[PDB]
Amino acid sequence: GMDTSGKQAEAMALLAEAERKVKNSQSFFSGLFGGSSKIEEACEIYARAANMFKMAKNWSAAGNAFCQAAQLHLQLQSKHDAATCFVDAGNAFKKADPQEAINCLMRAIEIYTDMGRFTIAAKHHISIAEIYETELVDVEKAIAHYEQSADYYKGEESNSSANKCLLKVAGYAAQLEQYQKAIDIYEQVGTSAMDSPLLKYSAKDYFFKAALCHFCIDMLNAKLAVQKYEELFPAFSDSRECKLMKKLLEAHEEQNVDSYTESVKEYDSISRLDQWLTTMLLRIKKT
Amino acid sequence: GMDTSGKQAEAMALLAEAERKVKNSQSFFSGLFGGSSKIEEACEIYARAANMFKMAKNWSAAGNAFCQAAQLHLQLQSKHDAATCFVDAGNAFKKADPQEAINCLMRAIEIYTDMGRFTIAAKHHISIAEIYETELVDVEKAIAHYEQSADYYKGEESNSSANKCLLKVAGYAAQLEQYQKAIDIYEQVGTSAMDSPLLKYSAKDYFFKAALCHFCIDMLNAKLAVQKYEELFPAFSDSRECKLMKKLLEAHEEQNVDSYTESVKEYDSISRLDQWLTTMLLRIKKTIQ
Amino acid sequence: GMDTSGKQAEAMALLAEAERKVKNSQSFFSGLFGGSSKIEEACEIYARAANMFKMAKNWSAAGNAFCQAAQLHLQLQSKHDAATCFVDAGNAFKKADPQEAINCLMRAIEIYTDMGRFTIAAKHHISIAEIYETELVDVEKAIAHYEQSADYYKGEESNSSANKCLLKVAGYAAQLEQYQKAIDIYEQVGTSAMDSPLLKYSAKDYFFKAALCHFCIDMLNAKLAVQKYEELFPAFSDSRECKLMKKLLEAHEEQNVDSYTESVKEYDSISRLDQWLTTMLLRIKKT
Amino acid sequence: GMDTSGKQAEAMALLAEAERKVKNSQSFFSGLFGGSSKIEEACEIYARAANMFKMAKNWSAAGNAFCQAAQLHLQLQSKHDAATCFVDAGNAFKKADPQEAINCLMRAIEIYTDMGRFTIAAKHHISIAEIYETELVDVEKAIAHYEQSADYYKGEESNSSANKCLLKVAGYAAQLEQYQKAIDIYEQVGTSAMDSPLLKYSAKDYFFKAALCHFCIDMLNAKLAVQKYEELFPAFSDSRECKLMKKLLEAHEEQNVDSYTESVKEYDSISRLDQWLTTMLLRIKKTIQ
Amino acid sequence: TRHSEIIKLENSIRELHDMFMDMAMLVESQGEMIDRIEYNVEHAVDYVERAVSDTKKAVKYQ
Amino acid sequence: LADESLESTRRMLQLVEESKDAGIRTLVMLDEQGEQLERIEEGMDQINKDMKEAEKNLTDLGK
Amino acid sequence: LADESLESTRRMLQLVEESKDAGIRTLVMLDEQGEQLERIEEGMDQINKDMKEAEKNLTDLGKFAG
């Protein structure tokens, strides 16, 4: 605690003697040209000083030390160690100031893509997208990052992760009122899930959301769409969701707010609703 | 996109550079006799170009480059890396040309089983069968591949995987092939699960399936098998499926299509169909006379 | 079929080549002192020959080749590869003739425990116990094996593994008219299961079982044990098991045989019993 | 035991050989040079002896041999072997005498955090806490260890383990420590869980515990806490815990022991009460006046 | 007799609910751990691959 | 009593539907873990084979 | 009323008992994989450390020789 802060100052002195090491590189390395291991141990002292900084809860200092060690270490050699240092710096920067974490993570992404490790690159893509969602307000950059990560994942037949990424992207797009992409993604994921006996209980919600998205744009074609879904999946009518949608669309033929309001309240009486669904219904049913 | 065009340009440049590298390597072996590092670095260039190219959204030439690199690597007495590259090439060609992927995967399977590894060989067999059935309309090759995978799994007491493979094989055979093999496999798998830790109450379904096959063959055999199962598995007496089957038996005995129709309608109403039982029931009803 | 015949033909070919290899290798070592590379080559030939024997569906000869390779390798002052060959031979001998499989697995366990690793020795012990139980009737050896594996597991802090072995040993001991060990194991595991956040719900079952076997003595002892357990687990009376035990005790005190039979049948109907419970209840009813 | 007898005999033989090997070490440190390899072989025989002693059920002897080998190994500029041997000695001392196990585990923790592996350090800290609380009759050191483990886990982004550790430490502290920390930790964990779909359906229990902690101090503040909770979490109003709390406080307002007792008995009728909740209810009852 | 049935139904349903919550928690924890171990294993694989490559090149230099 | 039965029926409905809804996602998570296990197994097998061949070749060359 | 009520109670009892038993069984099995998974993490991290230190020391020794 208070005692480990004095040794953090001593770790700043360790950074000072690492400054002396780079001074060796400046002047003395002419006679110590074979001391590349000296540079390696300079990087090691950098790394453990940064570890002491991390234990000292100086996130900015820890990230600075991580970045400096990565920059010194990436002498066109031991690239994976540099990538590990960069990702450590990004994790340290996740708290406090995360802006430069994005740049260090993009550099790690480039390094891994050059190496060809798609899985870790896609995981970092998801990480940057989600930190964008939770810290910043931009969604388009997160959308692009998620699309790229989904492409990378689907490249290696990792269908579940790509499907969930596309589900989140479609939900956000529906929030961003781009319904063609939403319905496309929802239909694709639902039909793919219906292929396997494992996920045959999950489609109902997917098809319900797709029907909502379709019915938002064109109400006349909503009947045809739901009929096509029912004939595709004969057990889609028995579900309460299909009944509720049919009731709502048949009631909309007559301008009676009471019928649909009572229907939605009755449905809400068995189970609570989500913000997305409630907002979508409030927006659409206004007219 | 700029990325796609630039990547394609640099990939073609790398391919030409690698071809010139291999030709000047053939020249240098006699000219300088540098050993084998020239071919190894040419293979490294080939692998880098192929992986960049597959990242470039283009697949077929990437798989061709992988095949060429693997062949050149295997030329130097190196097999495991060649097998992995063959597997990668087959995966890439999965979406480009099924035949080349199948050939590469067969080569990988044979080399792997020559090494001694069987689980990976069984997985590759299952993948081959899945790709063959999903797009190409053929079963017998799929049945043989599934049987080989089950054999390989049982060779290393992988009971669950072999059980699943044999279940799928029996289902396919009953759907298309004769019923004797389906009867044996279904009965064996059903009776090999009496003392399951969690699956104590699941074997019943299997038994039911077997009976239907018997009921497809002959009435006397069907009733005899029902009685033998009743005696063998007392719990099967209290199964709703047993009552349904007895009702269907007694209805079909007296040749009253209405009774069978209403019984099957009620059964579907109580529980939803599976798209497989309905077909067999239709085939049974087709011989009511 | 044809593939098996060809594999066996080339396997006999390679076996002839391998006997030639060993003979000429000893001859060349005597006459030239070429080292031990030829012995390693012969070992690899033996290993691949055994592999293709397994491919040929001849497990006895494959296991024989594996054992020969293992003994030759341990003669070469190397153990781990010899241990792998021994365990491979044991797996091959599991089917067909499993007698010598027991001896080879004993040798593997001996070498492993000599090295100092416990979990693999426990796995081999439990596998040997399973072999004895499934193919033989000498349950004493199975009890010994299960107890030894359980002791190893508890010593290595693997309580979860030890619990299953203890339960099996207790069940088998109760089967052979021996109740002290069953009572002790069941009560100990139930007591140690009191505080498990997950297992607590099932902690009742073991207790009930103990009571049943403890009734094999006489009316009274059983009442004291069940009431002690009820105090120790206040919620134990919630389940129907305590009601059933009280019904059994009251019916047997007055010699109400028909009521006892009807209550057992009713319990069977609401929830069926297994062979062990039925046999124990019938044995209790005899007196 | 004859096997145990021979095992102890060869254990004594190995101990005598280890004594001869420490003689070799002191001779090669003062008489000869290059004894590092000789004392490494001494460490190997020490480890063999300790392992076989552990096999012999002599846990104290095995732990003592492990500690001696570890302290001898520390001098060879080697740290990870020292850490492994210290962990082995601590595991051996876990049973029988665990007091020195705490010291050895703390030394191992210090060395580990010197290297930088935090997760394993957190697991060892939690092991120290659990052994101390189960075997040593003292809780404050357990509180400190749980706080350290939570800090380490939350500093490494391992959220779930830190959440469980914080919940456990807060619940324990609520028993014998001021409820302010319990209130803060319960509120924090509930807020963290609400957004997540994992424990959103279980956060009602945490809110109930926080409300009970609020009530145990005062009533008006408890009413403010419950109204704030139901304002921020609308679905809690339908929770049976909400009605139970409202009935309890309504009864307490009028100072009727009878109604409060009957209401708590009715609540106990369904489901079952817990030791901690029963103690809290009794404590709040005892100050009704 | 039906009132006893409804009481037992409530009790068992409540028990199954609590069980399911516990299983969900444990499954989440296991998945988290699987993620971390997969990451570490891939890193080790890459490290050993480059190690063998560099060592072979160093031997070739000899 | 009958109204008590009806409200208990509502409770049963809510509990059953909630349990089923959670079951769906639990099964999805189990599927994801089963998917990851095969990849980790394959990577581990590859590393084991590579290290074995490399170390054996180096040892043979050392002679 | 009587026949349907008896059917309902019987089916409810059997289904509830089956679900309860299966849930308890899954509960008990999960812990085994949990503990094994702790063990495999231990082994993996030990392997990582050992190989890292071995290779770095060997590179240093090779540099000393060369």
PDB file of N, CA, C and O in Angstrom, chain B residues 223-251:
ATOM      1  N   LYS B 223     -45.923 -58.167 -33.479  1.00  0.00           N
ATOM      2  CA  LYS B 223     -46.493 -58.528 -32.185  1.00  0.00           C
ATOM      3  C   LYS B 223     -45.509 -59.348 -31.360  1.00  0.00           C
ATOM      4  O   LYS B 223     -45.410 -59.165 -30.140  1.00  0.00           O
ATOM      5  N   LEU B 224     -44.765 -60.254 -32.002  1.00  0.00           N
ATOM      6  CA  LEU B 224     -43.776 -61.037 -31.268  1.00  0.00           C
ATOM      7  C   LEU B 224     -42.700 -60.139 -30.670  1.00  0.00           C
ATOM      8  O   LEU B 224     -42.298 -60.324 -29.516  1.00  0.00           O
ATOM      9  N   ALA B 225     -42.220 -59.160 -31.441  1.00  0.00           N
ATOM     10  CA  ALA B 225     -41.216 -58.236 -30.926  1.00  0.00           C
ATOM     11  C   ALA B 225     -41.781 -57.376 -29.804  1.00  0.00           C
ATOM     12  O   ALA B 225     -41.085 -57.089 -28.823  1.00  0.00           O
ATOM     13  N   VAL B 226     -43.036 -56.944 -29.932  1.00  0.00           N
ATOM     14  CA  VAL B 226     -43.655 -56.168 -28.862  1.00  0.00           C
ATOM     15  C   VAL B 226     -43.715 -56.991 -27.583  1.00  0.00           C
ATOM     16  O   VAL B 226     -43.401 -56.496 -26.494  1.00  0.00           O
ATOM     17  N   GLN B 227     -44.108 -58.261 -27.693  1.00  0.00           N
ATOM     18  CA  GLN B 227     -44.162 -59.121 -26.513  1.00  0.00           C
ATOM     19  C   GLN B 227     -42.775 -59.341 -25.921  1.00  0.00           C
ATOM     20  O   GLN B 227     -42.606 -59.330 -24.695  1.00  0.00           O
ATOM     21  N   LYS B 228     -41.768 -59.555 -26.774  1.00  0.00           N
ATOM     22  CA  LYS B 228     -40.420 -59.791 -26.268  1.00  0.00           C
ATOM     23  C   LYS B 228     -39.883 -58.559 -25.552  1.00  0.00           C
ATOM     24  O   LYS B 228     -39.231 -58.674 -24.507  1.00  0.00           O
ATOM     25  N   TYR B 229     -40.146 -57.367 -26.095  1.00  0.00           N
ATOM     26  CA  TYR B 229     -39.743 -56.142 -25.412  1.00  0.00           C
ATOM     27  C   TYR B 229     -40.503 -55.970 -24.103  1.00  0.00           C
ATOM     28  O   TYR B 229     -39.922 -55.568 -23.088  1.00  0.00           O
ATOM     29  N   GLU B 230     -41.804 -56.267 -24.108  1.00  0.00           N
ATOM     30  CA  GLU B 230     -42.597 -56.199 -22.885  1.00  0.00           C
ATOM     31  C   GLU B 230     -41.978 -57.061 -21.794  1.00  0.00           C
ATOM     32  O   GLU B 230     -41.818 -56.619 -20.650  1.00  0.00           O
ATOM     33  N   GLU B 231     -41.622 -58.300 -22.134  1.00  0.00           N
ATOM     34  CA  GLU B 231     -41.019 -59.188 -21.146  1.00  0.00           C
ATOM     35  C   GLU B 231     -39.627 -58.711 -20.741  1.00  0.00           C
ATOM     36  O   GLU B 231     -39.243 -58.824 -19.571  1.00  0.00           O
ATOM     37  N   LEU B 232     -38.857 -58.176 -21.691  1.00  0.00           N
ATOM     38  CA  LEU B 232     -37.475 -57.804 -21.405  1.00  0.00           C
ATOM     39  C   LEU B 232     -37.401 -56.535 -20.563  1.00  0.00           C
ATOM     40  O   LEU B 232     -36.619 -56.460 -19.608  1.00  0.00           O
ATOM     41  N   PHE B 233     -38.205 -55.530 -20.899  1.00  0.00           N
ATOM     42  CA  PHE B 233     -38.172 -54.236 -20.216  1.00  0.00           C
ATOM     43  C   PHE B 233     -39.529 -53.991 -19.569  1.00  0.00           C
ATOM     44  O   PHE B 233     -40.451 -53.479 -20.229  1.00  0.00           O
ATOM     45  N   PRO B 234     -39.708 -54.342 -18.291  1.00  0.00           N
ATOM     46  CA  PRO B 234     -41.038 -54.182 -17.677  1.00  0.00           C
ATOM     47  C   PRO B 234     -41.566 -52.759 -17.732  1.00  0.00           C
ATOM     48  O   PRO B 234     -42.774 -52.559 -17.911  1.00  0.00           O
ATOM     49  N   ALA B 235     -40.694 -51.758 -17.583  1.00  0.00           N
ATOM     50  CA  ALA B 235     -41.150 -50.372 -17.645  1.00  0.00           C
ATOM     51  C   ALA B 235     -41.829 -50.067 -18.974  1.00  0.00           C
ATOM     52  O   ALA B 235     -42.758 -49.251 -19.025  1.00  0.00           O
ATOM     53  N   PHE B 236     -41.401 -50.729 -20.052  1.00  0.00           N
ATOM     54  CA  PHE B 236     -42.007 -50.503 -21.357  1.00  0.00           C
ATOM     55  C   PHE B 236     -43.498 -50.808 -21.347  1.00  0.00           C
ATOM     56  O   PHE B 236     -44.231 -50.314 -22.211  1.00  0.00           O
ATOM     57  N   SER B 237     -43.962 -51.608 -20.384  1.00  0.00           N
ATOM     58  CA  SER B 237     -45.390 -51.881 -20.271  1.00  0.00           C
ATOM     59  C   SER B 237     -46.172 -50.601 -20.009  1.00  0.00           C
ATOM     60  O   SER B 237     -47.258 -50.402 -20.569  1.00  0.00           O
ATOM     61  N   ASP B 238     -45.639 -49.722 -19.164  1.00  0.00           N
ATOM     62  CA  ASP B 238     -46.350 -48.529 -18.724  1.00  0.00           C
ATOM     63  C   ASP B 238     -46.115 -47.327 -19.629  1.00  0.00           C
ATOM     64  O   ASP B 238     -46.581 -46.227 -19.310  1.00  0.00           O
ATOM     65  N   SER B 239     -45.408 -47.503 -20.741  1.00  0.00           N
ATOM     66  CA  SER B 239     -45.150 -46.399 -21.653  1.00  0.00           C
ATOM     67  C   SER B 239     -46.390 -46.083 -22.478  1.00  0.00           C
ATOM     68  O   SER B 239     -47.085 -46.985 -22.956  1.00  0.00           O
ATOM     69  N   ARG B 240     -46.668 -44.788 -22.637  1.00  0.00           N
ATOM     70  CA  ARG B 240     -47.767 -44.362 -23.498  1.00  0.00           C
ATOM     71  C   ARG B 240     -47.591 -44.897 -24.913  1.00  0.00           C
ATOM     72  O   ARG B 240     -48.572 -45.239 -25.589  1.00  0.00           O
ATOM     73  N   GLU B 241     -46.343 -44.975 -25.380  1.00  0.00           N
ATOM     74  CA  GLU B 241     -46.084 -45.533 -26.702  1.00  0.00           C
ATOM     75  C   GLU B 241     -46.582 -46.968 -26.796  1.00  0.00           C
ATOM     76  O   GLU B 241     -47.063 -47.394 -27.850  1.00  0.00           O
ATOM     77  N   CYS B 242     -46.478 -47.729 -25.705  1.00  0.00           N
ATOM     78  CA  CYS B 242     -46.958 -49.108 -25.720  1.00  0.00           C
ATOM     79  C   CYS B 242     -48.466 -49.162 -25.937  1.00  0.00           C
ATOM     80  O   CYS B 242     -48.961 -49.960 -26.741  1.00  0.00           O
ATOM     81  N   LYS B 243     -49.215 -48.315 -25.225  1.00  0.00           N
ATOM     82  CA  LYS B 243     -50.662 -48.280 -25.413  1.00  0.00           C
ATOM     83  C   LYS B 243     -51.015 -47.846 -26.829  1.00  0.00           C
ATOM     84  O   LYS B 243     -51.915 -48.419 -27.456  1.00  0.00           O
ATOM     85  N   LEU B 244     -50.318 -46.834 -27.348  1.00  0.00           N
ATOM     86  CA  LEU B 244     -50.580 -46.385 -28.712  1.00  0.00           C
ATOM     87  C   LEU B 244     -50.330 -47.508 -29.710  1.00  0.00           C
ATOM     88  O   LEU B 244     -51.126 -47.728 -30.632  1.00  0.00           O
ATOM     89  N   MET B 245     -49.218 -48.225 -29.547  1.00  0.00           N
ATOM     90  CA  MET B 245     -48.881 -49.301 -30.469  1.00  0.00           C
ATOM     91  C   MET B 245     -49.891 -50.434 -30.386  1.00  0.00           C
ATOM     92  O   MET B 245     -50.269 -51.008 -31.411  1.00  0.00           O
ATOM     93  N   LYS B 246     -50.334 -50.780 -29.175  1.00  0.00           N
ATOM     94  CA  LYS B 246     -51.344 -51.824 -29.035  1.00  0.00           C
ATOM     95  C   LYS B 246     -52.655 -51.406 -29.692  1.00  0.00           C
ATOM     96  O   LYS B 246     -53.318 -52.219 -30.351  1.00  0.00           O
ATOM     97  N   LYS B 247     -53.050 -50.142 -29.518  1.00  0.00           N
ATOM     98  CA  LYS B 247     -54.263 -49.649 -30.160  1.00  0.00           C
ATOM     99  C   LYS B 247     -54.142 -49.718 -31.677  1.00  0.00           C
ATOM    100  O   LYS B 247     -55.070 -50.154 -32.368  1.00  0.00           O
ATOM    101  N   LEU B 248     -52.999 -49.284 -32.214  1.00  0.00           N
ATOM    102  CA  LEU B 248     -52.783 -49.357 -33.656  1.00  0.00           C
ATOM    103  C   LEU B 248     -52.822 -50.801 -34.138  1.00  0.00           C
ATOM    104  O   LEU B 248     -53.387 -51.098 -35.195  1.00  0.00           O
ATOM    105  N   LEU B 249     -52.219 -51.708 -33.371  1.00  0.00           N
ATOM    106  CA  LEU B 249     -52.233 -53.125 -33.719  1.00  0.00           C
ATOM    107  C   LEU B 249     -53.659 -53.644 -33.821  1.00  0.00           C
ATOM    108  O   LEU B 249     -54.050 -54.242 -34.833  1.00  0.00           O
ATOM    109  N   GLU B 250     -54.456 -53.415 -32.777  1.00  0.00           N
ATOM    110  CA  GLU B 250     -55.812 -53.949 -32.760  1.00  0.00           C
ATOM    111  C   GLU B 250     -56.685 -53.292 -33.820  1.00  0.00           C
ATOM    112  O   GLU B 250     -57.576 -53.945 -34.375  1.00  0.00           O
ATOM    113  N   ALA B 251     -56.453 -52.011 -34.117  1.00  0.00           N
ATOM    114  CA  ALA B 251     -57.203 -51.357 -35.184  1.00  0.00           C
ATOM    115  C   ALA B 251     -56.851 -51.951 -36.542  1.00  0.00           C
ATOM    116  O   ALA B 251     -57.739 -52.331 -37.313  1.00  0.00           O
TER     117      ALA B 251
END
